[PDB]
């Protein structure tokens with residue numbers, strides 16, 4: 432029963448169940464307004480994707496694309512396998528107080544279940560050809576899933592310039608578990624106004640959790 | 654009833670009460686082994702201390718020196734007021750897998766109760782003149798407090814080289830609350846073997862929480 436709106440909305444998540452306690456007491460929650468940044472000597476993130484997107488699901492909260500095993504990123508010398516990617520509108524993260532109209536999340540898990548999420552901002556621009564393939568088949572109602580005709584390579588949704596912001600955060604939907612590595616790409620991608628409109632219409636409203644305080648954290652920039 | 658040893662010891666803290674839940678589920682706990690470090694362009698920490706130490710307490714877990722109001726540090730543009738300093742042996746933080754024999758913590762709180770702690774490592778060496786003043790009057794039993802004859806300036810216990818490690822962490826004793834700014838000084842201070850021995854004898858054993866995983870975190874170095 433958690434939602435983006437009303438009485439079961441984000442400000443009340445932590446009161447819905449005991450398992451959602453982090454949504455209430457957590458001090459390292461996501462998303463954030465990226466507005467306390469320091470230059471840091473970070474390593475490039477190794478992105479080892481192959482074409483693997485198989486299905487597209489509407490879960491009522493987002494449009495989620497499942498990925499078959501074998502694609503991974505490397506962070507802190509550890510392999511995190513790509514499980515799925517999904518979308519939010521407007522952007523969950525903000526950048527110096529401003530939203531983008533759309534944000535993609537690429538969700539990865541190491542062998543022990545530790546999570547790393549790559550966030551990619553999308554601005555209004557030219558029609559995105561990869562998103563067109565998914566949008567063409569996007570399920571309208573919650574609980575519906577469709578198989579993709581051809582396997583999409585998620586790497587095509589990532590910018591070529593791979594500078595990034597990094598911080599220690601959380602999942603952005605309940606249970607809002609902490610210990611999550613956030614990698615937010617500096618360079619924005621593009622999609623059409625129409626593509627953005629379609630996603631919003633299907634979702635039926637905004638799909639972003641409000642930004643959460645940074646508290647003791649800094650954001651590191653590569 | 655939490656302790657450093659036995660059945661109420663650090664591995665069991667999280668099971669002692671509901672209020673100690675972070676000690677069990679927290680993914681941003683302190684202390685840590687400082688072993689995933691990145692150079693960062695951090696600003697110097699402004700340290701505006703005056704002579705203000707008034708009393709020395711043995712609370713059974715540490716020797717704690719209270720400070721009168723008016724001394725503060727600046728972090729992220731915010732003023733955090735020095736409340737107290739206290740000690741652990743051996744060090745709580747490790748540095749590339751190794752302990753120092755002793756560590757001091759300088760505990761600060763901003764106007765909203767957000768905490769910032771400065772950690773200072775001590776190595777065995779020449780006798781520390783400032784610590785000698787406190788040690789001379791150190792209460793030997795839990796619950797005993799003594800007033801200092803003369804006010805001490807905590808700044809004299811900080812290194813002159815002010816490079817530091819920074820990360821987002823927790824209090825190191827229950828309730829192990831998160832959202833704490835840790836500033837660990839890169840340069841070690843010095844104290845005599847005798848001084849270390851005396852503190853240890855009075856405490857009756859080790860006073861350090863075991864290091865906790867870094868999880869998604871990096872340590873930034875100035």
Ligand SMILES: CC(=O)Nc1nnc(S(N)(=O)=O)s1
Nearest residue numbers: 536538548601602603604605
């Ligand atoms: C099962 C799973 O992955 N759950 C997620 N919940 N929130 C996520 S997000 N917005 O942080 O990427 S992923």
Ligand SMILES: CC(=O)Nc1nnc(S(N)(=O)=O)s1
Nearest residue numbers: 758760770823824825826827
């Ligand atoms: C009253 C107060 O400051 N409590 C503290 N508990 N643990 C601390 S530590 N080892 O993280 O400095 S300070």
Ligand SMILES: [Ca+2]
Nearest residue numbers: 469470652694
């Ligand atoms: Ca710069």
Ligand SMILES: [Ca+2]
Nearest residue numbers: 594595617653
């Ligand atoms: Ca750049």
Ligand SMILES: [Ca+2]
Nearest residue numbers: 468594617652
């Ligand atoms: Ca920049």
Ligand SMILES: [Ca+2]
Nearest residue numbers: 592594617618
């Ligand atoms: Ca660029």
Ligand SMILES: [Ca+2]
Nearest residue numbers: 617618619620
């Ligand atoms: Ca740009």
Ligand SMILES: [Ca+2]
Nearest residue numbers: 618619620621
């Ligand atoms: Ca672009």
Ligand SMILES: [Ca+2]
Nearest residue numbers: 472691692874
């Ligand atoms: Ca270096």
Ligand SMILES: [Ca+2]
Nearest residue numbers: 814816839840
């Ligand atoms: Ca030095």
Ligand SMILES: [Ca+2]
Nearest residue numbers: 816817839875
């Ligand atoms: Ca240095």
Ligand SMILES: [Ca+2]
Nearest residue numbers: 839840841842
């Ligand atoms: Ca040194």
Ligand SMILES: [Ca+2]
Nearest residue numbers: 840841842843
């Ligand atoms: Ca020294």
Ligand SMILES: [Ca+2]
Nearest residue numbers: 690816839874
């Ligand atoms: Ca160094």
Ligand SMILES: [Zn+2]
Nearest residue numbers: 517519536603
């Ligand atoms: Zn998401």
Ligand SMILES: [Zn+2]
Nearest residue numbers: 739741758825
């Ligand atoms: Zn301490």
